[PDB]
Amino acid sequence: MGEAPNQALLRILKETEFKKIKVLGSGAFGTVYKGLWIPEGEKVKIPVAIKELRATSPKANKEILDEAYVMASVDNPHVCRLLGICLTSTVQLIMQLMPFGCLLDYVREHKDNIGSQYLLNWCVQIAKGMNYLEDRRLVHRDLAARNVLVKTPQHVKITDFGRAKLLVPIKWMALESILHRIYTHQSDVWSYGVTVWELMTFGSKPYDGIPASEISSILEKGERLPQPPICTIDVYMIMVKCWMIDADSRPKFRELIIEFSKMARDPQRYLVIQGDERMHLPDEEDMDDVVDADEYLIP
Numbered sequence: 473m474g475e476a477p478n479q480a481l482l483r484i485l486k487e488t489e490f491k492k493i494k495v496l497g498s499g500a501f502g503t504v505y506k507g508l509w510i511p512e513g514e515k516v517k518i519p520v521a522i523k524e525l526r527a528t529s530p531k532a533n534k535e536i537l538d539e540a541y542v543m544a545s546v547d548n549p550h551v552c553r554l555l556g557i558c559l560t561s562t563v564q565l566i567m568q569l570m571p572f573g574c575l576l577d578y579v580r581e582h583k584d585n586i587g588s589q590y591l592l593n594w595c596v597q598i599a600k601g602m603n604y605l606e607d608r609r610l611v612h613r614d615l616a617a618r619n620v621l622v623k624t625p626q627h628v629k630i631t632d633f634g635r636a637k638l639l640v641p642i643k644w645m646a647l648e649s650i651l652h653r654i655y656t657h658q659s660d661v662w663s664y665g666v667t668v669w670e671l672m673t674f675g676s677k678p679y680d681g682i683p684a685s686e687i688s689s690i691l692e693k694g695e696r697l698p699q700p701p702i703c704t705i706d707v708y709m710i711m712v713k714c715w716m717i718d719a720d721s722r723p724k725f726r727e728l729i730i731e732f733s734k735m736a737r738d739p740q741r742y743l744v745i746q747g748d749e750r751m752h753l754p755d756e757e758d759m760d761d762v763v764d765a766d767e768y769l770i771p
């Protein structure tokens with residue numbers, strides 16, 4: 473016995489059980505649709521996001537089903553679970569609709585109305601989700617602001633298990649990952665560091681202008697990302713601790729939960745943002761029987 477048996481349920485969804493309403497976005501990753509899932513026996517309507525790829529190949533469906541595996545194996549409030557799969561020629565992955573999109577886009581568009589309370593609560597929530605993945609022996613290998621989804625402004629979740637492994641994004645990776653392809657829970661802490669830096673700069677591109685091949689030399693010299701204008705030394709020290717050369721010297725995710733949650737009790741002591749007190753963030757026939765997927769638990 474090396475590990476415990478994974479007794480997760482892979483739910484297979486009929487094409488008749490759900491309907492694509494519209495396209496949300498297109499990319500290299502694929503095509504994501506907004507939709508409504510209606511389980512046949514129940515009287516519920518569950519808002520969903522359906523992920524297709526751009527052209528069916530065996531290597532594509534291999535990679536889709538590996539994502540499904542990992543995503544069906546997780547259950548935590550700050551981690552995106554897979555609701556099910558649909559067996560089209562190319563496999564479709566179905567999850568919870570996250571109305572406000574990814575956190576990177578959210579901070580760029582809502583830069584002017586994001587308080588210190590929100591930023592620090594997001595740091596806690598991401599640390600909780602990452603700590604859960606560490607408890608499940610899962611290294612994420614691709615934590616970034618683009619792979620955090622926003623259910624509400626008060627509630628974010630980690631996504632993207634396309635690179636997640638059971639124990640390329642050069643500008644989010646630890647030094648040992650770039651040089652030697654070594655990936656641990658502590659290399660995810662580096663990427664957490666860069667993720668926090670993205671949020672505190674309202675979605676700036678890290679090392680903007682510099683090409684990816686020069687990054688390893690930059691980090692070996694001792695250079696790191698700059699202190700964001702809004703950050704106190706207290707917050708920037710946490711980011712700098714995530715980017716230590718010694719991986720064991722970096723914080724644990726459980727420690728990051730503690731540090732940010734202490735800071736979240738008194739947010740204006742740790743982030744300095746102009747006009748912080750003023751900051752506010754938020755079919756008819758469908759709305760009658762709408763249950764959010766987090767309240768629709770497995771029979």
Ligand SMILES: C#Cc1c(-c2cnc3ccccc3c2)c2c(N)ncnc2n1[C@]12CC[C@](NC(=O)c3cncnc3)(CC1)C2
Pocket residue numbers: 496497498501504521522523565566567568569570571572573574577621631632
């Ligand atoms: C990638 C994806 C994605 C996902 C998702 C992730 N992983 C998945 C894994 C398995 C199965 C399905 C998955 C679905 C997602 C979601 N569940 N709910 C809302 N949106 C989502 N997106 C986005 C697609 C376009 C989008 N656009 C904006 O955020 C935007 C742009 N411009 C102005 N405002 C907002 C960027 C990401 C929203």
